[PDB]
Write a protein that binds this ligand. Structure first.
Ligand SMILES: CC1=Nc2nc(N[C@H](CC#N)c3cccc(Cl)c3)nn2C(=O)C1
Ligand SMILES: CC1=Nc2nc(N[C@H](CC#N)c3cccc(Cl)c3)nn2C(=O)C1
Ligand SMILES: CC1=Nc2nc(N[C@H](CC#N)c3cccc(Cl)c3)nn2C(=O)C1
Ligand SMILES: CC1=Nc2nc(N[C@H](CC#N)c3cccc(Cl)c3)nn2C(=O)C1
Ligand SMILES: CC1=Nc2nc(N[C@H](CC#N)c3cccc(Cl)c3)nn2C(=O)C1
Ligand SMILES: CC1=Nc2nc(N[C@H](CC#N)c3cccc(Cl)c3)nn2C(=O)C1
Lengths: 160, 160, 157, 157, 160, 157
């Protein structure tokens, strides 16, 4: 009965995040998609919007639970009885930062294992920040997002 | 009749940028040096100052046109009838970011080819941000800039 | 859940032991798979490498050590493994790791490549570096299981 | 404008076809230049590599396939090329690419090295990886032109 | 009689910084641990707090002088009669940035040599920014700091 | 203070001269240590490499050129060196450099590895690239001391 957490800002959730969480569900019994409540930089979408969007986009995956959190991801994993922390590794990931984070998470909770998954080649060169920057500048990002996220991002930028 | 765009903030234009745009003119019939009107971080020089400086520094290159833009660089390339997008690759470039940008630009305009040029070893370890940071801290940056840019940067920091 | 941990393991080091131990804490059964790897011209034969890894992992009840000369994705299919473990130390290896994982996915899409990070203690060593040091009579006891250390001493003697 | 696209092309892959196709859309004439490369001990002879690349690029009207054993900058001068094309997949290759481009510039300053990025589809493959998979009887049809796939099958048979 | 400067923000000084400065004292006759007075991002600790903390943490090292500075690190090295500039290289260091900085420092003061030291494996994956981010989020960072720094960081976060 | 600058120096280049010159401005005595390196199958014998480096560094009064086949940490101990110099050009080398430095520290904790950065002029060359260019009759005079250039010409003749 292995429980895994998949933390992030998911601002908004992309097809790359869907690809990662789907691979995680095929490996672990229970996956908690954990959304950061209060990131350093103010998010485009509120925590409620981000939770609602991730819930709709993962509804077809029976063993995914979407939950918000504001504490250390290691503390959150300990409270969720999770022994696995999922991180996606795109071709464009900051590997140096992943090593720092994993070694720090191990110092905080040694029994918590950081697991790196690789997304499809299709999502290996995108990020939520690149998608948003393109969208803010009127670029087509439909291909990178679930339908519900595309509709919400269009509505957000219409009134900005 | 190949048309190439060379986009950037050019805040201010450096000898590294001059080196890149010169190599581009030797390869393509028409080069548009495209200056970003409204970057995320407020620039040191206004768009008019940046355009005027780049115009003076490239005047000796007959097939360079200096133009400001505020849209997506792929949209700007499509409107300029350009099929080539020039990016300089210094030894200190963020290659991971270049891959993201190139793959995103290809998604937005598939017929637009991203072309990476390498500057002289002399300019392979500098950037406008490093030059400005050194200049703000009273360091000698004459070697890295065209004469007109050096005079304008001295005048800017005199009144800051 | 069955996971495979493939490699040349020429010889198996404390870094490899660290990885396979983390894998056993996550998956029900772990197959430590030793590739014949003749193109790399290994120091130890496949039988020596299998015997050494068996002795070094004996204390881990859910590890099975097996040799193979097959394509690793075919070997993973034949072992009924849906997880392929790879250890990650630094950025340089991460690139070849991406190629291998994308190729393994093309050959077997249901086989998931997972990357584990070793202890800081083993983050700067490799079988190649240990062998190079041992060839120049340097002390490598700290980096190897005891049985591997004695076999490497005997091999270079 | 004449551009040269040099390499070992042992064998030519879909990633190489992707690069040379992008080059033809930018330059009037493209020379796909196959280096003898004896130090790498190639799987296919230079004649086989030339024949394979010729058949695989026949549909591209402005590609000329030529073999060479010369210094690539001397070969580019002799082909009246002012552009040298190199494909870029990841960071690790980008370093050796910088050395090669700065050396080529020292030897021929008027020859410009340009870097093109392949499709995401071919961003994780290489001739070496394809050959390694094919040696272990793995399916590599997806990564190669048909004629190259059959020649690689015949070579390993 | 070689004099070396070891510059940084030291916000706060960590065991990684102590490891680096200790290695520097074993190599050079006089080491100046140089604390940046006015960094770009506002520091957690004031310059006086940072100086006091670094002084207490290096007191056992007889040939270390802790000094604040607000000018270019190359100008500061020239004024301190230092011909060596120490930079720590952790496994997670931004090497591209280190190359830019070293080449710029060499342009400003060619006789000033940039020297890269490697910390213990124990401190190879941490930074002051990661330690602070973990501490702000109630994580245990005792292991990464000198005792006096741990007490000061606890007091800082108690009133924040 | 005694510093050792070890390497294969096959042959010694202007980049190596740049590094050793910076080292002499920092330390009282510098030992340029040439590793036999038989596994790399060097172009020049150890005696040729020692003779060439001696002639190329003669103008630097505090450089001693010595050959060794020993573990570099044992050689540094025997030379009474507490500093080990390594030149740093780019990120790719920085990883192997970290492994080597952490291993050298394990073998000799009082021996400090220091990294120096060469001039921008030599930041894109290596002995391997210079030899490869010279093998194809390319001009490499700019990258080598005069005596090394003539010896490399004579070796390839
Ligand atoms: C070792 C570390 N553990 C950490 N846990 C958190 N948690 C917050 C929770 C909230 N809001 C967060 C903020 C932004 C993104 C994410 Cl994914 C998570 N931050 N954090 C670190 O920066 C370092
Ligand atoms: C795929 C992308 N395409 C893009 N085009 C732009 N255009 C703006 C125009 C203005 N002002 C800009 C801003 C700053 C620097 C530059 Cl060079 C260009 N941004 N942008 C992205 O961030 C991503
Ligand atoms: C996608 C790929 N599939 C592959 N299967 C194998 N199998 C051999 C078995 C033998 N000898 C092997 C050799 C070296 C290391 C390992 Cl772990 C496995 N190699 N191989 C690739 O290099 C790439
Ligand atoms: C600056 C340099 N100039 C050079 N010219 C050559 N030429 C040979 C021709 C043969 N065989 C070659 C070998 C392998 C790949 C290529 Cl693409 C070309 N190699 N070479 C360097 O390695 C560096
Ligand atoms: C070539 C460069 N030389 C430089 N010297 C300084 N000095 C300031 C002094 C203050 N306050 C400083 C600020 C933050 C951290 C440090 Cl370590 C030092 N900044 N700086 C550059 O950004 C680039
Ligand atoms: C931590 C290590 N210690 C080591 N000592 C040696 N010594 C040999 C001497 C000979 N031949 C050598 C070979 C090649 C380059 C150099 Cl610089 C030195 N190699 N070696 C390692 O590769 C790793």
């Amino acid at each position: 009965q292995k429980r895994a957490i998949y933390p992030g800002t998911f601002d908004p959730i992309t097809n790359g995040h869907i690809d990662i969480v789907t691979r995680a569900t095929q490996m672990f019994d229970h996956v908690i998609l954990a959304i950061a409540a209060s990131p350093s930089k103010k998010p485009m979408f509120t925590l409620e919007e981000r939770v609602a969007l991730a819930q709709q986009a993962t509804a077809h995956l029976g063993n995914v639970e979407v939950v918000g959190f504001s504490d250390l991801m290691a503390n959150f994993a300990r409270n969720q009885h999770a022994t696995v922390l999922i991180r996606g590794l795109r071709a464009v990931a900051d590997f140096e930062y992943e090593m720092q984070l994993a070694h720090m998470n191990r110092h905080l909770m040694p029994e918590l294992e950081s697991v790196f998954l690789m997304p499809s080649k299709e999502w290996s060169f995108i990020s939520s920040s690149l998608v948003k920057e393109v969208a803010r500048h009127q670029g087509d990002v439909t291909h990178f997002l679930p339908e519900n996220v595309h509709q919400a991002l269009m509505a957000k930028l219409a009134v900005d």
